[PDB]
Amino acid sequence: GSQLNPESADLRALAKHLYDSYIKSFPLTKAKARAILTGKTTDKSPFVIYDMNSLMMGEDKIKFKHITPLQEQSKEVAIRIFQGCQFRSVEAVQEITEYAKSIPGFVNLDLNDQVTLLKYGVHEIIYTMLASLMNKDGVLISEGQGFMTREFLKSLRKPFGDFMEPKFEFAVKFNALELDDSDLAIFIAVIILSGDRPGLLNVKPIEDIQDNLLQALELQLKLNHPESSQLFAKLLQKMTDLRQIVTEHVQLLQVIKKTETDMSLHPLLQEIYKDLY
Amino acid sequence: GSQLNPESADLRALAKHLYDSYIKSFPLTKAKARAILTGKTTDKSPFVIYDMNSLMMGEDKIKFKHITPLQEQSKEVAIRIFQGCQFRSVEAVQEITEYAKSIPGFVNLDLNDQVTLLKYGVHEIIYTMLASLMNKDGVLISEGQGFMTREFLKSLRKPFGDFMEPKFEFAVKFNALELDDSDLAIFIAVIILSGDRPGLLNVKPIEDIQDNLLQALELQLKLNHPESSQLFAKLLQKMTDLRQIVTEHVQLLQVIKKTETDMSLHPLLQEIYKDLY
Numbered sequence A, B: 001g002s003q004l005n006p007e008s009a010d011l012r013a014l015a016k017h018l019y020d021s022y023i024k025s026f027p028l029t030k031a032k033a034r035a036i037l038t039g040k041t042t043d044k045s046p047f048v049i050y051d052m053n054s055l056m057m058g059e060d061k062i063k064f065k066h067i068t069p070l071q072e073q074s075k076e077v078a079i080r081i082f083q084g085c086q087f088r089s090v091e092a093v094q095e096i097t098e099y100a101k102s103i104p105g106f107v108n109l110d111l112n113d114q115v116t117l118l119k120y121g122v123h124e125i126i127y128t129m130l131a132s133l134m135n136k137d138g139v140l141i142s143e144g145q146g147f148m149t150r151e152f153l154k155s156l157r158k159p160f161g162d163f164m165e166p167k168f169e170f171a172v173k174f175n176a177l178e179l180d181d182s183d184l185a186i187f188i189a190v191i192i193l194s195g196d197r198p199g200l201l202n203v204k205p206i207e208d209i210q211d212n213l214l215q216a217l218e219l220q221l222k223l224n225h226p227e228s229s230q231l232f233a234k235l236l237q238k239m240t241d242l243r244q245i246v247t248e249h250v251q252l253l254q255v256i257k258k259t260e261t262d263m264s265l266h267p268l269l270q271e272i273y274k275d276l277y
């Protein structure tokens, strides 16, 4: 807290540290994603998926990350897309864990508490980050190479047609807050350091780090958004919305798998892609 | 304790008006509840119900809110307790409604939105307020004249066995924040004015009132708890725990509605449970 206000030095160093770590861990930033979604893409437009024919072409042309399960699982599109999101979600776990280790104090916590914080936090972070690739009309696919429309995802078979809708509804409201990457970098760090996680052995250093992160975010929002009145409080309220998407996703995994006979892929693939959904 | 600034001054006057209305609307405050639970063991001492035998001995001794004149009971302990809590929730709706009308701007809102704010606000408030009446060992009952143990409530017949546990678990963590009646007045007003409720016609006028309630809650907590670093952020995150209790209570009632065909549900609560998520 050396001059400027004061209490604008250790907190500003923490804010900048997280921002740099976030840029390093998550290459597709909100800034880069918005440029594509608004049309400032520098005439390098993403491939649009609006129906089955465009999906078929994108798989051959762009060669998406979800083209792979055309050798282990069924040809059913709705199942391939749903499992593809599951595969990306498990891939994201590693990006989030690398980011978490860069949070001052996180590596010094009890090894079991680190596992617990990442286990319950990753899903809340996935949905927060997913908002950055979404607008009212769709979502950016595979590193911004494609754009899958909201209508196409809604056109999907009986249980799968409603899977992306809760994330779209949240995204529209979360995006109205108009946060940028430097804001998100601190918000995701606050999510990880949640002291109410079940099975936590030593809550004290967790809440101590989170309180320091909350102070850094409160300041970040006041400096970057002076006109957005209670932006900090409004953002904290969105953690209710995040937790609800997570609880609803768990309900869907119960509706499917206990109605879905089309298996869950190769035994080794099933093992790699479990729990982190 | 504003100390200059006409902005801080308006927020203090708002905090003052809300605390005033809360005292007028809710007869059993947290302050009174704590005085009964802790020290002052004279005319304030409650009768303790810890087993089936003590419950029977209690009805004959002190005339509680569950043993009113004429056949209005159920002639079965587990159901009788649950029905009493159901009737108390109806009375609480009248108290919360009275308090809701005192929040500046609430009565000015579209009538349909006034109904939706209360439909969803009610249960989250009952549970927040109920924490004031609890400790880890039990709950104050019949206007603080009695005290029912957590263990006697946990030991009830099969469908009612777990019924109070999510409330007691929430109360333990919520009570750890050490909020007083003056903080609760603002927080419950913040809960009612939730712009993210389903079916709201005009979100913007609700959000504007909530923004001002959040500003008044932030100042209140900083002045009343200056040694409690991020109390405001910790309090806003508890709104997630509130939502989960509601979801479980509703799920619990669906089971009761099927297994207990002869148990009546109040129309007022039936309208509340209706299109609830």
Ligand SMILES: COc1ccc2c(-n3c(=O)n(Cc4cccc([C@@]5(C)OC(=O)NC5=O)c4)c4ccccc43)noc2c1
Binding pocket: A026, A028, A064, A065, A066, A081, A084, A085, A086, A087, A088, A089, A092, A126, A129, A130, A133, A139, A140, A141, A142, A143, A148
């Ligand atoms: C940067 O931080 C982030 C940002 C985003 C995600 C994320 N995620 C995501 O992108 N979608 C939308 C989507 C839709 C369709 C196909 C695909 C994929 C898998 O299939 C395809 O062909 N391209 C693909 O990307 C992806 C998700 C949908 C659901 C859950 C997580 C999703 N998981 O983890 C993340 C980390």
Ligand SMILES: COc1ccc2c(-n3c(=O)n(Cc4cccc([C@@]5(C)OC(=O)NC5=O)c4)c4ccccc43)noc2c1
Binding pocket: B026, B064, B065, B066, B081, B084, B085, B086, B088, B089, B092, B095, B125, B126, B129, B130, B133, B139, B140, B141, B142, B143, B148
């Ligand atoms: C705004 O402040 C508040 C404060 C509290 C409540 C509240 N509530 C509550 O008090 N309990 C605990 C309890 C336990 C046992 C018996 C009884 C009663 C009803 O039955 C009996 O025999 N004696 C009794 O008091 C009451 C609840 C339990 C469940 C739901 C709501 C409950 N509903 O609404 C409120 C508004």
